[PDB]
């Protein structure tokens, strides 16, 4: 049942709540339909994050800062990777050259590009999407 794909990181009740405005935060609520994105593998390993039926399309600001609203620029293309820690990893190929892979702040928001390397664990996102099992 491919639908609202919930994604978040860092132990603790906090979900990625996207808003048409662009300022997406880690809202810890599931009452208002604003914490779901249409995560899917567009190309071989390339997964896109688009909150179609709830918010907007993502468009990272040079990886450094994560945002989305206007258009799903290539910045929004990430390589789907999995870690043996019950978490999902997405490498922003657009900036992979700098070893930068999408990282968000559970209690801040998605914008840690200068810190999207091996140091911050927030890069290990925990997905709760409605798969087709």
């Amino acid at each position: 049942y491919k639908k609202p794909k919930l994604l978040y990181c860092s132990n603790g009740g906090h979900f990625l709540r996207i808003l048409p405005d662009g300022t997406v935060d880690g809202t810890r609520d599931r009452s208002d339909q604003h914490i779901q994105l249409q995560l899917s593998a567009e190309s071989v390993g390339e997964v896109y994050i688009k909150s179609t039926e709830t918010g907007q399309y993502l468009a990272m600001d040079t990886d450094g800062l994560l945002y989305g609203s206007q258009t799903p620029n290539e910045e929004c293309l990430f390589l789907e990777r999995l870690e043996e820690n019950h978490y999902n990893t997405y490498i922003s190929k657009k900036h992979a050259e700098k070893n930068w892979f999408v990282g968000l702040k559970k209690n801040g928001s998605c914008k840690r590009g200068p810190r999207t390397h091996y140091g911050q664990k927030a890069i290990l996102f925990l997905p709760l999407p409605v798969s087709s099992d």
Partner: protein, 98 residues
Amino acid sequence: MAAEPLTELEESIETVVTTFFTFARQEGRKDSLSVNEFKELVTQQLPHLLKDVGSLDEKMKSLDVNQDSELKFNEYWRLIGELAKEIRKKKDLKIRXX
């Protein structure tokens, strides 16, 4: 069961090593702090010990003996000595101290 506690000395090197690592990986190579990278440590998590957030160049030159503009793990590590010294030492000459 799992997540076994080690000795206090293993605990304390880890906690600083992870912090180090969360700054070392900022730019090219996740071991070396380059100039900005290095300055980011002091300017963020060190406002009292080394309150000199302007003459980081002096520290850099004092640290990076080879002046490659990379504080490798062991070069960077020097700072931790000057820290571990300062906390006791700080200005045991004029101030006082506390």
